Amino acid sequence: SLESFLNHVQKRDPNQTEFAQAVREVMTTLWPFLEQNPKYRQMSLLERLVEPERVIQFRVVWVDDRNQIQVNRAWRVQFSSAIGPYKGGMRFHPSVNLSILKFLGFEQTFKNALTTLPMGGGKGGSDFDPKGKSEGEVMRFCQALMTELYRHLGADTDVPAGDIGVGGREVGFMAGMMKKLSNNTACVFTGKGLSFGGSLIRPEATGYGLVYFTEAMLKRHGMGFEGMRVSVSGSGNVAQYAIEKAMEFGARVITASDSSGTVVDESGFTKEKLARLIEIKASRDGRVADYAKEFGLVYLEGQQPWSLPVDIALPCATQNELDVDAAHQLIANGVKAVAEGANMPTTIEATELFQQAGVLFAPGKAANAGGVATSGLEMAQNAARLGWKAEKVDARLHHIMLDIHHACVEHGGEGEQTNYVQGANIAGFVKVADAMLAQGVI
Amino acid sequence: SLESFLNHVQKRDPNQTEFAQAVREVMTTLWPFLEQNPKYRQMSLLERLVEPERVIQFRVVWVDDRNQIQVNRAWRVQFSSAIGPYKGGMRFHPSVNLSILKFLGFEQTFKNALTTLPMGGGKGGSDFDPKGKSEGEVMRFCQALMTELYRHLGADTDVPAGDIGVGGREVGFMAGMMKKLSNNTACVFTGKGLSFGGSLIRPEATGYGLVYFTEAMLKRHGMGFEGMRVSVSGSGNVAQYAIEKAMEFGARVITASDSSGTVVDESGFTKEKLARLIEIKASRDGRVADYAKEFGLVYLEGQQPWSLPVDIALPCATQNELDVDAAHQLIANGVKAVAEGANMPTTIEATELFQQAGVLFAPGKAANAGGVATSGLEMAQNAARLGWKAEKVDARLHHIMLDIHHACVEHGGEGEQTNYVQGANIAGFVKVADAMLAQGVI
Amino acid sequence: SLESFLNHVQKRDPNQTEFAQAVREVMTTLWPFLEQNPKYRQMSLLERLVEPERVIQFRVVWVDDRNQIQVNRAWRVQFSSAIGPYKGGMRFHPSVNLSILKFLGFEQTFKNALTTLPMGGGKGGSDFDPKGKSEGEVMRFCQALMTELYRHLGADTDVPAGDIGVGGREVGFMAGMMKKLSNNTACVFTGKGLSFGGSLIRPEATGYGLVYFTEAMLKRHGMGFEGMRVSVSGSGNVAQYAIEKAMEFGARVITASDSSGTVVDESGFTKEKLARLIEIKASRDGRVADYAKEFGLVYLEGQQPWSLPVDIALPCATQNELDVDAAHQLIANGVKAVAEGANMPTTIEATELFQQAGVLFAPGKAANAGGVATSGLEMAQNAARLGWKAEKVDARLHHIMLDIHHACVEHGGEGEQTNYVQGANIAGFVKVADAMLAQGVI
Amino acid sequence: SLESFLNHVQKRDPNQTEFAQAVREVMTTLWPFLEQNPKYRQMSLLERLVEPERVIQFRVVWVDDRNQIQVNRAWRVQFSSAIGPYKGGMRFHPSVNLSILKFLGFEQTFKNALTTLPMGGGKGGSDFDPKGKSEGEVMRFCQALMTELYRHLGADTDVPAGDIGVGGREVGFMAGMMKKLSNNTACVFTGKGLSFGGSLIRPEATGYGLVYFTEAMLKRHGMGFEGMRVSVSGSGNVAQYAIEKAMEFGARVITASDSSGTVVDESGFTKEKLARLIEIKASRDGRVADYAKEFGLVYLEGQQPWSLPVDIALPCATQNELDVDAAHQLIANGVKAVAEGANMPTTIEATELFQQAGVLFAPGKAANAGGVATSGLEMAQNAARLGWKAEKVDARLHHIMLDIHHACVEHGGEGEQTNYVQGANIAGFVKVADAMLAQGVI
């Protein structure tokens, strides 16, 4: 009984709402697999899995620009080290609390496991509010935080990163203070700048990865991006470099979009066209509408791209942006594959409609894992003591996406088509679970 | 004077029989090389080499399923770190003592050195008897052992592994407790499972490597596996994959065996038959006898394969399984090469008979070194934080075995045949000796 | 069954002759106590007690005055930490081996426990032969030993000291290298010189304590040192201050001795005379014969003191210096008490003979414990960062000896005389055993 | 103001002449760049950059062959860790002092940054004089130094290497003692022997690298080594392999030199001729003069090679060996390029004179960086636990020199020729500066 297990887990954290849902969602997805595979239920594995190995809550005292002393709370949730060191970002936001952090770390554990890289799961942050703070205040805050936290991190223990409220700047400040205090230059943060261990291809990683996974998916079922019509939704990081990589595989990419609307280009994106789009949206005022005016292209004011007949659709905008109705249209127009660039873009029913219609479907938890894979490649480069050329990082990223795809296929069923939703849900759990079982009662 | 040196060394250890024999066999092989190369006798090098850097003997207290407290003794012999960290397995068996462990660690030093990977030499274990113990008892014991041992290990200090009485299961339990206690996920054990840092090809490594090495040896002397009759003893992972690779080179592999007896198949193993042998020996009760019934094959009840006339014998079962009576049969029946898959299958007397009969003979320290070489490749992959495809691992294992073969040939003399016993010992020693000399009086 | 336990215990160390005897002796005295106190047999306490927590064996390489590189073996036996850190001396002697060091650590564990101070048990040394070595060779040897050993010691871990082959000079060298390498000045050795943390009364400690112990023993049985003829053997540290304190309690001390022979003084030592013996003996070559010649005293060239009629005999030279024939003479001439300043001076047979003749007998295991007790007071002063005046060290040493004596009486039976062999073993055992039980299965 | 800044810097070190000169030279080259880029002046970056993070000065006491105790001074200057661990050699010479070590470490910081490898900057040494010392004295000195120094080093903290007075022998001794004391086998010294972690191509690296770099520079400007007359000064490591690689690129190499004089060979070096020069110079007594005598070549007793007409001059002997008069001779005789194999062989005035005459000039700071770059590759192989073939090391070295050439060109101006002085200095500064800025005020 699912409800009974969930009810039991909640007894310890009656008020951690977010964590409660995160446990429910994972368990709801796994329950039929667990019923058929009693092995992954033994040794109180599920009870072990939902209890984080270690949580550190600590006081952060710092001084603001008015010389007022401020007190914040920070955390590092070290959830699972079964597969490798705790890995996951730091988040600075006034709403952050333990519940939210456990929810993120819990999910990260499976997300990291899914990449096939040797990374555990963790997450941290503070109720510190970066909004309105000077560079100096943020620096002092990062340093005060690291004055406690440094003792709990390490290249083989816990390697944090950025998240909301924690960008390249803050990672720099935290990595610098880690190094000073420890007198040790090993990789303890990813998302570092290129001057001190960061990796090339990080901006391109999620988009590139989306296309790699989808091509693997297409090769296995006798198709490929070459010569295909491709629609993309969204126009940030992920959408941009997705477009770039599909072009390298011979795809004709014909749409991009933002919240206000969709640009349509049947002759297709080119290197130049995409360059100017990237430039435009790097401003805060830039709009797809402006990109279209500039190149004399069709603009569809507040519509999505799903009305266009394509072979492949890549939603890279936001959650729930591809519903049942759009799925019916894409199917009717002959779509062959769908892969998720964004976080949970396709609704559950639309996912199901694609699958029953024999449309290849790649869930985001797998197809957008390039972002997280590259934090692993950064570690790998730092470990090797050699920075790699962009092409080398990219080639290695490609092989990782092929490994993730292989993992989904392993658990993706025996049907005429692989079920990548099922495959991606199971692969992450199984790897963590196998590792926990091999390592005994610890 | 050899005898005088041997007599002097024993004074500290008048009752370490196994260790004395080990120092004797090695020194006897080295003595003429040392006569021609006084460099390697300077700076009390031999006296330094035979004295292990460090030994930890310690008490292990644990509780059995009847709530009785048991006391065992354990050791880690950290013999040499001249070339790299102490490397070598852990052995659980009621007969284990300091003498035996020093002999094995001493042997490990030269074997590791020969692989060309940067690994020193060590060995450890306990007089704990795993026979009849429940899983929980083995677990509690492993953990109580790690409660002391964890402080003496490290990814750049001492990296153990399995051996008799210590398989994948036990490695997992020790690695897990190491991780918990040190709060560090770095590679301190090899032979780990794929879910927490293990390497592909590790199961095939020794068997594969054995055939790669033996093929090199044959080719150098105008032969090859192609068309040869091959007897293999044993039916565990070494034997299985020795059989697998020899078939791939065109050999007719005609025997396999366990403790109960030997199966004979004059037409030879196939992929399908070996697959089925593996399935059978994967159960806890499966016996070569069952495998013989299923394919209608000759079964030799409690006999070894050695009465059969073959071109190549490959002992892959246990220590001392090929003694003088067997050797006489093999030689009389025209065997051309003997190579050791297991650890020290051939007795000192049987070994000499093979060499004096002009039979190519490959000692395990060279020929079965694929396993430990591949344990270095495991360490390497963990250090890089990126796993290799099976093909990359196989290709590197192969290339390493050819380098090992080349070193043995370099120091194996000028006779009509290479002396691989002489060759492997001198090649191993020179690398350890050059390193001990460069690094000063320490 | 005693024989059954001793036989089981011996299986792991079939050739450790000295260690078997020590275990046999302790266990024979305890067996009746244990029958009456089943509590102390539970939880495999005895099997745990006889197995040392940790032993380190290691290589020591050093260069002699002719530039020949020498190799020796060293050990630190860290036997018990139940009551406090491992405590015990280091011994340099060519006969040293693991068996002997285990025998010494085992005793040390009980002797330290008896003092009431918080000290565990340990012992170490090397087969290094200090004889004929220059100050420089010993220094280099000590430093090379410490290059390894320092990592296993600590003010709260293992605090060694001197013994045979290791005096103040060697303690100084080892303590110095400990400080350099650890960059830490805490007390990691006792027997230090006054200039760097040593304690007053240390040179006097063993001799003083012997007299303190023997005086309690005498008083309990209607006697005292006053007016007694006392023979002392030996002429180093222990004997000298045994003589000093005995004169202080009003005894007429009539002998002292070295390897070469015995000085006899019927009128008894005086302060004046003893001062000059101390000067003579402060060299390593100084002789009693020269001391006897200077005061016109009888020299019994190569004889022991035991032919002389005395009330009290105090063996303070070496192990086994008083056998049955000597004991027979002592009994026949009317001896009332024998107390051991040295370590195991009286042979088992001479001992039994004293007990059967109603001669009061204080075993070294209790009576010579002042030295180690004062090494505890050295630790205490160092921890406090404040040294004590001599009167204070001496007063506390005295109290301790009275506690040791009281403990021996409690368990020495109700007979006409206290059995101090029995008493000291049981009292020592009870303290270690209570600590082991309270601290769980470790 | 440059002068006011140089003066501010000097206030702390009024008598460190070498250091003051080094800071002046760097800042003079950068000053125009900094004016155009206020970013690189912010946050007191320059004041921070010239003050070393950490310097440890320490006493080294050791015993010479006459048993006299000697006292020396040693240092490790840990200058910059912005980019990676402190990296740089140890120098044993009686003239060594803090000023000299700071100058070298400061420069080291920029040369290391330039390689694109993740290396900080450091330098160390002692006023210990190795000249006339026995192997034993040198070993004991190295061990006594490491007895203190080991605690400040680490594979991710500070990884030293050799220099004047510290060759392979000394690296071996120091590494060995590092390993012994830390019980850790990770790479903390580069320049190791092949038996314990050294890299192939290390002897060839500076010479190879010099030619690789110069070749890029000639090609960028329409030239190449092919068919060119090349003069080389020196006959050590750097000159041998400079010659080796230049012959391989089609050069006619016509000189080599030592302190005593110069050999001229108009027909050019050959493989055999260079082999014999190496042998001769591999001895302690070998002289270029003897080499000239042997092959019947013109010897210019104590003159330099600069009077000789060449297309390319490669100074690889010592500091200040090429001054203005020599530059005038080279220019008048039609020289096209000068590249520095040694450290600052060319004086500022001679440098300027080459630049004003349109002669391509490559500073050592770029052109001789192959050595330290290859020490980075040594670190890298150790981190990977895998040695590379000579060919792989060479290829990787080559690509690194090409990366260095590309960075110099990026910052070398728009003139008819790249200004590599300006280019190598700015490129080095930008990498370090970016890193310091990102990591905050630490």
mmCIF file of C-alpha atoms in Angstrom, chain D residues 190-339:
data_model
loop_
_atom_site.group_PDB
_atom_site.id
_atom_site.type_symbol
_atom_site.label_atom_id
_atom_site.label_comp_id
_atom_site.label_asym_id
_atom_site.label_seq_id
_atom_site.Cartn_x
_atom_site.Cartn_y
_atom_site.Cartn_z
ATOM 1 C CA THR D 190 57.162 16.658 -10.959
ATOM 2 C CA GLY D 191 60.451 15.707 -12.597
ATOM 3 C CA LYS D 192 60.157 12.177 -11.169
ATOM 4 C CA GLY D 193 61.970 9.165 -12.652
ATOM 5 C CA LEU D 194 60.070 6.817 -14.977
ATOM 6 C CA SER D 195 60.005 4.096 -12.270
ATOM 7 C CA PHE D 196 57.814 6.174 -9.918
ATOM 8 C CA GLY D 197 55.605 8.503 -11.990
ATOM 9 C CA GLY D 198 57.765 10.509 -14.328
ATOM 10 C CA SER D 199 56.680 11.362 -17.797
ATOM 11 C CA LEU D 200 58.239 10.644 -21.149
ATOM 12 C CA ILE D 201 59.187 13.777 -23.163
ATOM 13 C CA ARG D 202 60.144 15.703 -19.908
ATOM 14 C CA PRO D 203 63.837 15.860 -20.972
ATOM 15 C CA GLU D 204 62.821 16.965 -24.451
ATOM 16 C CA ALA D 205 60.102 19.399 -23.397
ATOM 17 C CA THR D 206 61.695 22.862 -23.149
ATOM 18 C CA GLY D 207 63.789 22.278 -26.323
ATOM 19 C CA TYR D 208 60.958 20.681 -28.247
ATOM 20 C CA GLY D 209 58.571 23.351 -27.030
ATOM 21 C CA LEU D 210 60.890 26.152 -28.046
ATOM 22 C CA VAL D 211 61.059 24.927 -31.606
ATOM 23 C CA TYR D 212 57.290 24.254 -31.721
ATOM 24 C CA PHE D 213 56.494 27.803 -30.631
ATOM 25 C CA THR D 214 59.041 29.463 -32.949
ATOM 26 C CA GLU D 215 57.702 27.417 -35.791
ATOM 27 C CA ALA D 216 54.203 28.853 -35.205
ATOM 28 C CA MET D 217 55.721 32.347 -35.060
ATOM 29 C CA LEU D 218 57.730 31.876 -38.317
ATOM 30 C CA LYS D 219 54.636 30.483 -40.117
ATOM 31 C CA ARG D 220 52.378 33.258 -38.949
ATOM 32 C CA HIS D 221 54.803 35.656 -40.598
ATOM 33 C CA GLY D 222 55.552 33.721 -43.792
ATOM 34 C CA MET D 223 58.632 31.732 -42.706
ATOM 35 C CA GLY D 224 59.509 28.345 -41.241
ATOM 36 C CA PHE D 225 62.481 26.419 -39.871
ATOM 37 C CA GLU D 226 62.909 24.670 -43.273
ATOM 38 C CA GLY D 227 66.233 25.431 -44.987
ATOM 39 C CA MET D 228 67.165 27.999 -42.334
ATOM 40 C CA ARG D 229 70.499 28.598 -40.631
ATOM 41 C CA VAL D 230 70.028 28.313 -36.872
ATOM 42 C CA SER D 231 72.456 29.193 -34.046
ATOM 43 C CA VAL D 232 72.005 27.656 -30.624
ATOM 44 C CA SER D 233 73.847 28.669 -27.467
ATOM 45 C CA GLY D 234 74.263 26.205 -24.647
ATOM 46 C CA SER D 235 74.764 22.471 -24.748
ATOM 47 C CA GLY D 236 72.592 21.295 -21.870
ATOM 48 C CA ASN D 237 69.080 19.897 -21.827
ATOM 49 C CA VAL D 238 67.444 22.861 -23.536
ATOM 50 C CA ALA D 239 70.007 23.295 -26.327
ATOM 51 C CA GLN D 240 70.295 19.505 -27.092
ATOM 52 C CA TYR D 241 66.610 19.060 -27.778
ATOM 53 C CA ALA D 242 66.251 22.454 -29.370
ATOM 54 C CA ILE D 243 68.820 21.227 -31.888
ATOM 55 C CA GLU D 244 67.125 17.849 -32.125
ATOM 56 C CA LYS D 245 63.778 19.315 -33.050
ATOM 57 C CA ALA D 246 65.188 22.028 -35.354
ATOM 58 C CA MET D 247 67.085 19.394 -37.385
ATOM 59 C CA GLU D 248 63.849 17.434 -37.638
ATOM 60 C CA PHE D 249 62.123 20.591 -39.011
ATOM 61 C CA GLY D 250 64.703 20.989 -41.771
ATOM 62 C CA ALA D 251 67.029 23.482 -40.118
ATOM 63 C CA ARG D 252 70.763 23.674 -40.633
ATOM 64 C CA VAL D 253 71.889 24.027 -36.976
ATOM 65 C CA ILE D 254 75.441 25.416 -36.965
ATOM 66 C CA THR D 255 76.429 26.156 -33.349
ATOM 67 C CA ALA D 256 76.279 24.948 -29.766
ATOM 68 C CA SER D 257 78.280 26.386 -26.851
ATOM 69 C CA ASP D 258 79.379 26.224 -23.232
ATOM 70 C CA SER D 259 80.920 28.559 -20.743
ATOM 71 C CA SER D 260 84.321 27.976 -22.314
ATOM 72 C CA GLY D 261 83.437 28.581 -25.986
ATOM 73 C CA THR D 262 81.519 27.878 -29.170
ATOM 74 C CA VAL D 263 81.591 25.180 -31.862
ATOM 75 C CA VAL D 264 80.732 26.214 -35.468
ATOM 76 C CA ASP D 265 79.605 23.609 -37.960
ATOM 77 C CA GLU D 266 78.618 25.115 -41.301
ATOM 78 C CA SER D 267 77.472 21.745 -42.692
ATOM 79 C CA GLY D 268 75.137 21.458 -39.693
ATOM 80 C CA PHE D 269 74.401 19.105 -36.821
ATOM 81 C CA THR D 270 73.334 15.555 -37.610
ATOM 82 C CA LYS D 271 71.751 12.879 -35.463
ATOM 83 C CA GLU D 272 75.080 11.160 -34.938
ATOM 84 C CA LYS D 273 76.910 14.404 -34.269
ATOM 85 C CA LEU D 274 74.327 15.487 -31.656
ATOM 86 C CA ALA D 275 74.379 12.017 -30.056
ATOM 87 C CA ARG D 276 78.137 12.382 -29.433
ATOM 88 C CA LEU D 277 77.776 15.933 -28.112
ATOM 89 C CA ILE D 278 75.204 14.644 -25.631
ATOM 90 C CA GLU D 279 77.526 11.822 -24.469
ATOM 91 C CA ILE D 280 80.429 14.174 -24.112
ATOM 92 C CA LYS D 281 78.262 16.683 -22.268
ATOM 93 C CA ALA D 282 76.717 13.823 -20.217
ATOM 94 C CA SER D 283 80.079 13.531 -18.485
ATOM 95 C CA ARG D 284 81.321 15.889 -15.822
ATOM 96 C CA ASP D 285 84.412 16.633 -17.791
ATOM 97 C CA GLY D 286 82.939 17.047 -21.237
ATOM 98 C CA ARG D 287 83.519 20.228 -23.166
ATOM 99 C CA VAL D 288 82.168 21.543 -26.437
ATOM 100 C CA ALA D 289 85.870 22.078 -27.259
ATOM 101 C CA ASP D 290 86.429 18.268 -27.113
ATOM 102 C CA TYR D 291 83.422 17.740 -29.334
ATOM 103 C CA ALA D 292 84.862 20.192 -31.879
ATOM 104 C CA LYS D 293 88.247 18.506 -31.752
ATOM 105 C CA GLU D 294 86.572 15.177 -32.399
ATOM 106 C CA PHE D 295 84.673 16.162 -35.539
ATOM 107 C CA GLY D 296 87.304 18.567 -36.904
ATOM 108 C CA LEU D 297 85.198 21.683 -36.366
ATOM 109 C CA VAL D 298 85.938 25.392 -35.856
ATOM 110 C CA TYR D 299 86.047 26.239 -32.129
ATOM 111 C CA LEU D 300 85.767 29.864 -31.074
ATOM 112 C CA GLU D 301 87.446 29.839 -27.750
ATOM 113 C CA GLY D 302 85.482 31.847 -25.343
ATOM 114 C CA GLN D 303 83.298 33.626 -27.775
ATOM 115 C CA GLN D 304 79.552 33.365 -28.182
ATOM 116 C CA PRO D 305 77.699 32.226 -31.274
ATOM 117 C CA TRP D 306 76.265 35.689 -32.137
ATOM 118 C CA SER D 307 78.907 36.877 -34.622
ATOM 119 C CA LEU D 308 77.806 34.041 -36.818
ATOM 120 C CA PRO D 309 75.236 34.776 -39.634
ATOM 121 C CA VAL D 310 71.931 32.923 -39.092
ATOM 122 C CA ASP D 311 68.230 33.131 -39.920
ATOM 123 C CA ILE D 312 67.248 32.099 -36.431
ATOM 124 C CA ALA D 313 69.078 32.517 -33.111
ATOM 125 C CA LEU D 314 68.044 30.364 -30.088
ATOM 126 C CA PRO D 315 69.728 31.452 -26.848
ATOM 127 C CA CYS D 316 69.519 28.368 -24.486
ATOM 128 C CA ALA D 317 72.398 28.873 -22.005
ATOM 129 C CA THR D 318 71.808 31.509 -19.273
ATOM 130 C CA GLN D 319 70.458 34.896 -18.296
ATOM 131 C CA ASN D 320 71.870 37.954 -20.116
ATOM 132 C CA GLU D 321 73.916 36.001 -22.681
ATOM 133 C CA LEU D 322 72.579 38.149 -25.546
ATOM 134 C CA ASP D 323 73.090 41.921 -25.129
ATOM 135 C CA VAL D 324 72.864 44.862 -27.601
ATOM 136 C CA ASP D 325 76.205 44.376 -29.388
ATOM 137 C CA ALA D 326 75.298 40.769 -30.050
ATOM 138 C CA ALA D 327 71.839 41.907 -31.231
ATOM 139 C CA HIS D 328 73.593 44.389 -33.593
ATOM 140 C CA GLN D 329 75.744 41.604 -34.970
ATOM 141 C CA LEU D 330 72.724 39.335 -35.453
ATOM 142 C CA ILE D 331 70.716 42.118 -37.146
ATOM 143 C CA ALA D 332 73.598 43.185 -39.416
ATOM 144 C CA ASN D 333 74.022 39.559 -40.407
ATOM 145 C CA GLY D 334 70.382 39.251 -41.404
ATOM 146 C CA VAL D 335 68.578 37.440 -38.514
ATOM 147 C CA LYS D 336 64.785 36.976 -38.900
ATOM 148 C CA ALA D 337 63.850 35.515 -35.527
ATOM 149 C CA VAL D 338 65.139 35.117 -31.989
ATOM 150 C CA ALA D 339 63.457 32.820 -29.458
#
